[model samples]
Target chain A: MEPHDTLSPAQVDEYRKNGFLVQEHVFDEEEIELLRAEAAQEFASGGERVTVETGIVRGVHGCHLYSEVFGRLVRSPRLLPIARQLLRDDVYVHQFKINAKRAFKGEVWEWHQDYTFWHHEDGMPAPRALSAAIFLDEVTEFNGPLTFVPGGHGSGMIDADVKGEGWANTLTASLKYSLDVETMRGLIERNGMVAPKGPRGSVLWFDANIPHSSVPNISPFDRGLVLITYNSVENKTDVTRGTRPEWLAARDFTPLTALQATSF
Target chain B: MEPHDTLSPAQVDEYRKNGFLVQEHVFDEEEIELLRAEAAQEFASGGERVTVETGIVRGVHGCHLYSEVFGRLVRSPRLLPIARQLLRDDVYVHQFKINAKRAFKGEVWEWHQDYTFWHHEDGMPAPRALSAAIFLDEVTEFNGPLTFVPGGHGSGMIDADVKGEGWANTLTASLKYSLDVETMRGLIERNGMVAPKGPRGSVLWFDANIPHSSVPNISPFDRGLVLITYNSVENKTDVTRGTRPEWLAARDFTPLTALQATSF
Candidate 1:
């Protein structure tokens, strides 16, 4: 049976128009705590897969590879079905990361379109990919919240100044293809910015082309986000052009089979 | 001729008593700028060597392996001679890293003795090692400055609760071998903590066994520290016990030949 949390017709239209959609309490408190515990344990384990910034672990990419709980999270009935419905195709996990914006030390993500890196670095022909950013902690405005330029996806690949070589340079605070202040100012002027904030388990589905960035967390509370990027099976990245590790962008394009189990 | 900035007998006595000594303007304005520029450029050139935590670049290990400017800094006439005198033996570069506590997001280095890791993980025989923490930026009291417990090195390897296997866990914010609150309180009570504040180019030499840590940076300024750990030739790490990367704990025990050149 299909998941009960499928997007309504209106919600689908809104997402298409504005480039983003939010689903509250998608996994509930109990499930969130389980996933959160697993994530905490995995990050604390420490490896090359984990990304550290300013002495705090900010991101852990491809947790599914190492974690049984995270692996189950990849094919969850609540999440996987939604991506299939939204993208109108069988999807594959392109990139999965736990963006643990720890208290006081979490850095800012500069303004850049997700498609910019996926296209230039990963060689994905189309912006058919989107991210399911599952909130693992209470996301308030005080904590570093992801702010999106509403309807910015419709702008169709905004011009970006290429910074340096490789995906490593692009992934960190320094974006390889980042928008300048004037471009960001123009985007804001045209469509304005919206920051989605709520309790844990709220999932935000955003388009690949939308320009988004987050501010540094100066608050005492930790802001954790587990982002699962789902790409259409038809639009697999060409390995010849892309050079990033599989953790950042998946090599496997096998469509994920949604699991019946709700709790991990 | 020996370098003019040789440690005085009084300065040597102070280091022996307090377990730390600061030398102001070890690298002049021009020299510091050159090193700083090279460091900034190298960090921008992202690689496996760089460590990011909380979305900020926290530490970059073994830059001397990559950059020409840093390689020269390793054998600097101003710095190497002082280390030779302090250890009273031939010295080798054990570990080198840029502890970049960037503005607002640089995480804390938890309270623990460095010798705990070197002894347990690297299988070093003694605490015959020290770090020359050179300030690459102006370190004010506000910007996550390194705090030292004066004469805490004399306590000699305070017992640490080993959290996990491997050095990666020990190096980051969630220190594997960290001291408890009560233990830290007692150390502070006996010998008060001092956060060294100075202009760029000043270097602080401290004992390996010293219980030290820094607070999180909430200020606008970035606190850049290039720490060069020099180990006595007689006290090399036995690699059979250690599984950490060479960058984190150097396998090279080559006693550095001091260069006559003052400038990089």
Candidate 2:
């Protein structure tokens, strides 16, 4: 028997088997508008988010910690219940970032699994968490939509060269750990690929282990996503790299109690 | 090939193969003397430790939070580096305790694996940690030395009855979880059995997956131990049990840096 909280059996199976789930209109218009408004302001919020070298906005890492709207979104009864259902355990927000890849200026995110950073840098020991991307703008092919290997998450951890430019953490990459070309081709042939394109208000959540990358947003329209990662409470990390700020890798492993619909 | 900082290659091999290693004088005379003296007195520091129906000292788990001696011991350069070597990754103290199994009063710790509690109660996702049991008092057959099945740690998880009087953790039991006599006997026969017994200064380290138990210390001599469970920085647990106090399973997942020799 499944939790049947927010996900269907087939949808859960799709997520487990293919390492991702794409849902249309998971959030209503009012909710979407609120998050979009909040994200718009934070996109302009200066400080550490603005990388001096690239002059890029990496997106606010733990937006939930600052805004009540995003906080509610992270703890949203509608969203987290799905994660709990898919994860087969209680879940917590490992990270919540509103990434804005500016028109023509946004750089590429290299090919690597999220768990590599979570394991090596954040201390999350296993690949048991997932990232939920709430589309803040219309995602089109030219706008550098996130491209993922269909089922490459099962490839697990492999050696990668995570160095050089565009490997930036303004959407940072540990350049030392980024994927190399030869290995990237190896994965492409094995699992094939898919890039879900949709309108604002659509949602796509993928397993943390999936190998994914995105190109530079050279198009006029910007491509932005509020990607929030939810980790199983069973898979919380020890702060192995203390250098990772609290905003980047949350220390609070408390299994969040889902917010009530009435509160919103 | 191996990080044999304090332990020899042979000792590391024995530990990996048999799931346990014993060292007669890993610590100097003064160090042991300091810990033993500190433990003897701290056994009386009350207010937090629970005495359930069975009269066992539900150990002061997060000893590093308050006690300078145990805190230093938890972060001790002499100890943590060895764990870093064994775990092959940075390590964190999952649980620390000065177990005072008072003479004639101490009760039995049932036959079970550490990962059982780590997974079910603490939400630790793997058996990537080991217990470093420092004998603060002489451990003998009469005074309750820890009895374990040799190479039993490699067997992974076993079904047992975790209900009844002894299972203190409120979130307990798969009944199916507690070790049955026939099964325990089977393991002993197949894997053989060993209980490393020695003087107060001696140290016994064992893998988390190992099946171990100790009887009540009914003898006049108190068989207390300063047992510290160190987990790989990667394998830290989320404090899943809301009822569980800080002392039982630490929420702090900070990768412990080794202390200087002169710190204490």
Candidate 3:
């Protein structure tokens, strides 16, 4: 079926019911060129918070706050309204991240629900949130596309235990309130892993509660995705349950305004 | 007395009593330059959490997590052991910041206690922490130097209220649980400000509870300092009272081990 100008009623319902939707052609060559220019510099500025395999950075956090190019993209006109539409409420950025699954060394992103981290670590009270990833490069079969479960959001916030291991990023080193291997295996057995691979400029939007993970990319091509996680303003929290890592989950609840295409 | 081979007993006492100690030439030019090259890229890369005045980046947050050069410095053989001695417990990086006080455009770091930030915002239980700044440039009177209050650590964590303004980072944008101006003025009146300016490669070890701030550099030079804050493992907390921003206060409690000396 042909895509609509704005989200069609079915697209919105499918997203609400199944917890994910892949929107295509959000940007043209001009916008992609503009962002690609700055994305390289950001990817190169990786530190210990990133997964560095063989001295090549694999994943990075907080790119939107570090680069104006990314800063604008996260709040871009085409993106924010869609997020607000799905949420049916005003929203604020809960977190921003750039995943660079570089060929031959990209690492695994453990199976987990995003809202669990938000609720526990960020003091976010509810599951009224969405995380969307804009593919920066052409995502293909072997390029470490995100693996997610269908209708996982309907399953609700899965009970998770705080676990930790040696990792270059906060996702692992500190602690991960993630599903055990057995549970993850059982869920995969029932739902099976779904890889939503697509071309550059395509956006894959998913619920904050959806259980998702990704594997390493051994392909020669690099897979890049920019994730902007948004939370409804009405669902804001004043309580805390876990660690406060600003980069991992942002504390800023200021509503983002759509920008005029100017200096950026 | 000349510098000790490994921070003498008197030096340690002075640090405990006076609340700070400066160790000279712990890092040689080669290492300093190796770090300086990478740090410049970090200082130059500005999003919004830092004070970007007149197109110059005045400060940065979470460098240890972003740059390998800084990551190694936080656990450097020449730096970590000394921090362990003062902390007297296994220490993890609480905060890592680079203040790029660029001559004419550098901004002020408001008077506040680092531990208060740790306690109120980060959930750190005590003031048992150390903040050490490695002078990356010639820190002179012309360049803005870190201003501190003597014996302030003994005063303990001062009371601070939440304050806000637009910042390049999460500090103010999220919520700055910072000191009020009236109290800051009274404290300044009693203790007096001390700007610990020194040559390149000088390491300033300070108590985290020490009340500190700085003036803007309206001069013709750049004063850069890399702060690696160490917090005792025993002092870690799971409950956050204020905002949870990972870069501000790290979530990782893994102990740091020293790195061997290698040429850049």
Candidate 4:
């Protein structure tokens, strides 16, 4: 397979076999700084935490900072082409979340794959999912590091065992024996963990199925990253839910467009 | 809060507050038998298993038996009205997965939520997710009862503290203590576990966010159920992967026409 401009042939193969590959410094440093500042301001003004429990704000959709930057980042040429290549198809933006790894005692991300939460219905193909984290500031191990298992995605559809605990909350108790902390440590030791330290504009791309997680940000400065997930348009599922048509509004790509031929 | 015909007013409140409700015998025994027979035959045909590891076929989209019955069941007047009421918005069929649950003795499902997988770049509104499992056969504790924690949805997003050894073949190793599992267990013990049993055709409606898990099938007969997930249209998340057009074909809904609105 000939390598695309954004991705090398070896990188493509690595992604295919291992389910993930990272191209360092994909975004500009200046842009990263701007986003970081914007995010810091948003967080300070209580712009990002706009859910029901917070009560500080009504919702995220109302924030201009989030809406504008998120929209632009998803459409950015630098990241989109790589996402398209890694996904091996024309992909659509599924959704985005502003992940701020806080510097607190209890704020750490647990190990998990993105797919555990998105199993496709029988007969339906699992959507080819991908995510990009636009680092707004420098990331280091002191606070937390984005950890990943290279060939983990190839394992495919590991059971998400949640027994009476809240969703995503009870996976540990449900599947007690399946986890391997030592191997994770070995991978971290071998690969040295990808804590992309740079000026503001760096982004990391990853396969959705890859086993990835983050440690808590115990550092004084906060780590900011705008994570965006994308799915191959070919694997898009229905977005229906009765009279409310808000999901339809989120779709920005046209269906059955010329992009289909290139995606597969 | 007036209840619908099947659910009492309090039941409706519970469904709304917690995001799920269960009504036994949503379908008659005869209907369940017909569906079960159809599913069994389909499973025997050596069709593509959604998760290759489990050999469990996901029978949505292309499966004739699935497309015919699932679409009908999802849009059923009996179910949709209640779903609409609980969701408090228009909803669409997210996707359906039919797990045969035919794993060996050591096989187990890891705990996680449907929404966590759905968390992507487009940003979805929390608590707007729901799913239902129609029992084609009597679900018993022997075979495997679908276990869920009452009020688990309120716990919100919990970090999957999955760690330890043997994480390879299974993803559960990464899960750690991110949520109060004891509290969740206590809640389940207090509210109790529900196993929707019937001659066949029993349906259990649940908030997709509720922490749920299924045990291995220890019985001789296969536990058949069509698990369908749905989301409100207003959720600002794309179900399709990045710009791929083919992904759109996986969706199982007919876009509502302007004329159809008048009829409804």
Q: Point to the candidate with the largest DockQ.
A: 1
lDDT of 3 by residue, B128-239 (tens): 8988899877665434566676777777877677555422233421236555565655555565556676778989999988876554443335677888899888876554
| DockQ result, candidate 4 | 0.01
How close to the true structure is residue A140 of candidate 1, measured as C-alpha lDDT? 63
Model 1 residue A228 CA deviation (Å) reads 0.2
Candidate 1 chain A lDDT trough over 10 residues, lowest sum: A213-222
| lDDT values, one for every candidate | 0.81, 0.72, 0.70, 0.52
Across A1-264, the per-residue lDDT of candidate 3 in tens digits comes to: 122235889999878866788888787767776776666776677464465544565557777777777787777777888888888888877777776776433554566788887776667788999998888777754446776777777778988877554222345422377665656655655665566777888899999988876654434457878788888888765435536556666667777777665553
Ranking of all candidate structures by their lDDT, best first = 1, 2, 3, 4
lDDT tens readout by residue for model 1, B69-168:
7887878888888888898888998888887876545665677788888888778889999999889888865456777788999999987878876566
What is the per-residue lDDT of model 2 for residues B183-224, given as tens digits with 9 covering 90 to 100?
775776587656678887778999999987654443346676
Residue-wise C-alpha lDDT for candidate 1, range A6-94, written one tens digit per residue: 88999999899999988888878998999889888878884777877847787788887778888878888888888998889999988
Task: State in Å the error of residue A87, model 3.
Answer: 1.2
The native-contact fractions of the candidates, in order shown, are 0.00, 0.00, 0.00, 0.00
Runs in model 1 deviating more than 4 A are A1-4, A261-264, B1-264
lDDT per residue, candidate 4, A97-165, as tens digits?
555644322132445667555442111147487877777666653334466666666666555434343
Which candidate do you rate higher for TM-score, 2 or 4? 2
Show pairs that collide, candidate 3.
Answer: A47-B66, A245-B245, A245-B246, A246-B245, A246-B246, B48-B168, B48-B169, B49-B168, B49-B169
Please state every model's RMSD to the true fold in angstroms.
14.9, 26.4, 23.4, 25.1
| Chain A TM-score vs. truth, each candidate | 0.95, 0.88, 0.86, 0.69
Q: Please give the distance, in angstroms, between residue B106's alpha carbon in candidate 3 and its true position after superposition.
A: 53
